[model samples]
Every structure is written in C-alpha cells, then in structure tokens.
Target: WVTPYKISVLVLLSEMSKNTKISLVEKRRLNKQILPLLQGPDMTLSKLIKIVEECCPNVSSSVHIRIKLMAEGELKDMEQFFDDLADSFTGTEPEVHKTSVVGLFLRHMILAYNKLSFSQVYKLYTSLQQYFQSDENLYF
Candidate 1:
C-alpha cells in the first residue's frame, strides 16, 4: 500500500514518461494510427454524441452520454441549458408572468442533473441569480 504522496509521485512520473520516449519514427506510426479516425464529415454535435455511446456501448442512452461527458469533462456547459430556458422566457412568450422562469429553470436543471448523486444545482442557482440580479450586461 502506497502513501498518498507516493501515489501522486508515481502518477506524475507516469505522465512524464509518456512525453519523453517517443522517437520520430514512433510519432509517425502513432499519427498513421490516428489518421483513419479523422477521415469523416466533421460530425454534428448530436452525431458525435451518438458515436460516443456506440464506442462505449455501456452508456445506454442520450442522457447517459450527457452524464458520461459531464463526468469526463467532455461536456461542461450545464449552464447553457439554463440559459436557453431563461431565453425562452424573454422572447414573445413571457413565461415568467405566468410562472417564475428562475423557478422552472432551476427545477428542470436539477432534474436533468439529478442522476449524479452529488449535484451542484444550488451553486448553479446562485450563479444564475447573480446574472439576473447584477447590473452587468444581461443581453442574450
């Protein structure tokens, strides 16, 4: 059993090793291996997401793709969904007069992210509150 510091040192050393040993010949070989994957229409966001699920096979659905991407740091814009919801309220249809946009947006965002046992919807709500309440530019 290794101490935390020793494990961290081992992890750092392993990352360093990856960059030091690749000769030009090996670099060319690795590039050749990667080239085939590059030959395709620049995949649309939805298509790329589908491909992610196909490659992993265990991730069962589009929502699962979203969850996995968020976990892996591939998908980081959880706020964008809230932004779109907020925008919808501002347009010709004023949902806020009938019902609170902030409340609805927060509710739905929480539901979407609830799959994670530890979620950050409260932090997100605080940020959104700041955006709306502050005097800064709220355009778009």
Candidate 2:
C-alpha cells in the first residue's frame, strides 16, 4: 500500500479505465482494500494477491503498461480512488497533499519499486483477471 510500485501500479490501473469501464469497479475495489490491510481475513487475501503479483517475471514499464492496458483505463479511476483516499489523508487543505499517491509515492521515496515495474500491475491484474475479465454484471 505504501510502496511506489504498488501505488503507481494502482495509478496505472486508473489509466486503463480510459478505454473501458473497469475504473468503476476498481474505484471501489482498491478503495475497500486499504481497509482490510489496516484486519480480518481480508488482509490475508490481499497479501496473497501481493505475493502472486511479483511472481510473473520481467513484465513491463509503467508508461508502456499504461498504454498496453487499453491501455490503462482501469488505472485512471483507481488513481482517483487513491486520490480520494489521499484526500482523506491530506484533507481538503490548501496544500491538499495532492494525491498522485503515485507521484507522492515517487517523491517521498529514494528508490524504485514494483515487480517488473508496470508489468507487475499487469500481472496483478491478470492474477485477479477473473474478477474484471467478464460476467458483465460486476457487483458493486
């Protein structure tokens, strides 16, 4: 949740939303996920996703992956979700902390992250592919 790669991948998921409507589902998904991390079996399930994410080897970069996701519409809204989450963190203050959570993740740290960069996000998406792939009746 605090990692640049993770958050940025979160951002990328938002970007992917531009083409499709995955962002809508994602907006809710990650929004709710942060809660689990902070109890319940939810954290365990999320942690499992994280572990499964880095498993794929040599994926792709954030920029390219964004383009690839359709290339990154899901990420755009997810970024907004992160942005909203960040809004809670920084508040509507004048400074606003400005939630790129993605940008901030990069700015606050002194290192690079992600499992194969954007590729990890892609892999992560694939790991949870079923949830987003179809069914169309995506429950809110």
Candidate 3:
C-alpha cells in the first residue's frame, strides 16, 4: 500500500486495451491523474471512470496518444450501448438528427463496488480519516 503508485501502474497495464495507444507524455499525465485517487479517499472504483473519459483525445491531450479510452478499460461504453436502444424518436417534435458524446457509468460500476453499503462506505471512509490528528488507525 505504501508504494501504491507502482500498484497503479500495474493496474493500468492490466486494464488497457491492445487497440489503445499512449505516449510518454500522456503516460506521465496519467500518473498525475491517479495521484490523488490512489493516495487518498478518492480512490474508489467510482473515481477511476472519469480517468477513462477525459484520457481520450477530446478530454485529454492533442498528441497522437488520444484514442480508445474505454479500451484502456477494455469495455465498450455500456452507457452508449443502452442510449441507442432507449433514445426513442419524439412523438411530434423533431430534434437534431442525432449527435455524439457521453458518466452515468461512474455510479453503475460503483454500484458493483466492494461490499458497498450504507454504513460500510462510511466505515472505511471514517476509519481512513485523521483519527488522532497526527496519524490513522490500522494494523488490525
């Protein structure tokens, strides 16, 4: 847990898609993004998602490294897949023929998080806080 950033790199390698590509520049940026998440309370599964979204060309860099962010996670956008099926035509009024762009997933997978429940979420969070004003509670 101390060298969590190293662990983050492993997860990054494990999760990325073969199709997606990144460069040294963007790769360093990825480390910047994950810093707060892995270092503190922000490191929930809910948190990793926006990392996927903004990591792409549109949300991330203009360098050639931008592409297939979800491939980094290696799962197609379930959000988009459902939108096609569910976004029906209007009964009367018409709109732009159709357009693009898509988070709703952040919460969905978080719904699949580890033993996540009402108080348990609080349990870990509270436990992780500055319990004694100088340190934390661990070593059970």
Candidate 4:
C-alpha cells in the first residue's frame, strides 16, 4: 500500500510528464504548419481530467476537473472544494481541516510542475503533518 505522500508525488509526476508530452506534440504540430490544433479531445479539460483520474482514482473526479482547468491557467471552473475546505480549517468543529490540507496539498502538487517552489512544497509537507496530527484516527 502506497502512502498518501507517495501517491501525491506519483500523481504530480505523471501529470507533469503527460502535459509535457502533449505540449511537445503540440509544438511540433505548430512548427510543421499543422495550424495549431485546438478543437479536439487534445484541447479539452475533460481529457486532462481523465489523465489525472487514471493516476489517482481516490480523488474525486470533480477535483481533478478543477485541477485540469487550473493547470490551463483558467479558474472559472474552479470547484467549491477549495473554498469549502478552507472554511473547514477555521471553525471549532474542524469541518474543513482535513479537506483543506488535502486540497491544498493537491494544489501545490499541480503547481509544482509549473510555478511553485520547493520551499512551498516543504511548507505543504508541514501543513500535512499538522493535518494528520489533528486527526489521529485518519486511516487509509
């Protein structure tokens, strides 16, 4: 059984590789006078979501869809999970604590392929530690 951290890292790497490969193919198409293909499955968020879902089935498909859209630098499709999870961390009942930690971790993982720094990931690790500590009974 892989740990959550391991799973997250694997998913991150897989997403990065897939995106890079696709972008490379797109570049080649553009350079070869292929008119920059942009209307098919290759350009759709659903396709990217499927890639993420294939790598990490434990995560919700809605979450992956948002991640895919966010990766493409669009946020209108962003889901409430992020905001709702953030809210969970502020209340006394610990409503968003778990979701906040995991959701933020997923965001950092996605961002790591593009703009997030290593120190930020270290902070995410620390935050995850706090999240896990707060819920002593969270089992896989």
The candidate that achieves the highest lDDT relative to the unseen native structure: 2
Give candidates' CA RMSD values in order: 21.5, 12.6, 15.6, 18.3
Roughly what TM-score does model 4 have, to 2 decimal places?
0.22
lDDT per residue (tens digit) for residues 1-140 in model 4: 11223322333333332353355555334223311211112322234344446543433354443343433332222223234433443363333423443344444434443353556544544543443343333352
Estimate, for each residue in 7-95, the C-alpha lDDT of model 1 and write its tens digit.
Answer: 12222222222334455465344434423223333322334334434432332243333333333341234444334434443453333
lDDT of 2: 0.37
TM-score of 2: 0.27
Give Cα distance to truth, residue 74, candidate 4, Å.
4.0
Return the TM-score for candidate 3, rounded to 2 decimals.
Answer: 0.27
Candidates ranked, most accurate by lDDT first: 2, 4, 1, 3
Write one digit per residue (lDDT tens) for candidate 3, span 1-140.
21212222223422331224766567445646644443354342223334545654332222112222312222223223223323332221232323311012222322333335646544433332222111212232
User: Which portions of model 2 miss their true places by more than 4 Å?
Assistant: 1-38, 43-73, 93-116, 132-140
In model 4, where do residues sit more than 4 Å from their true spots? 1-59, 75-85, 92-140
Q: In candidate 1, which residue pairs get closer than 3 Å at backbone N, Cα or C atoms, i.e. clash? A: none
| Candidates sorted on TM-score, descending | 2, 3, 1, 4
Report the poorest 10 consecutive residues by lDDT, candidate 2: 37-46
- Can you tell me which runs of candidate 3 are displaced by over 4 Å? 1-10, 13-20, 42-44, 56-140
Q: Weakest 10 consecutive residues, lDDT, candidate 4?
A: 34-43
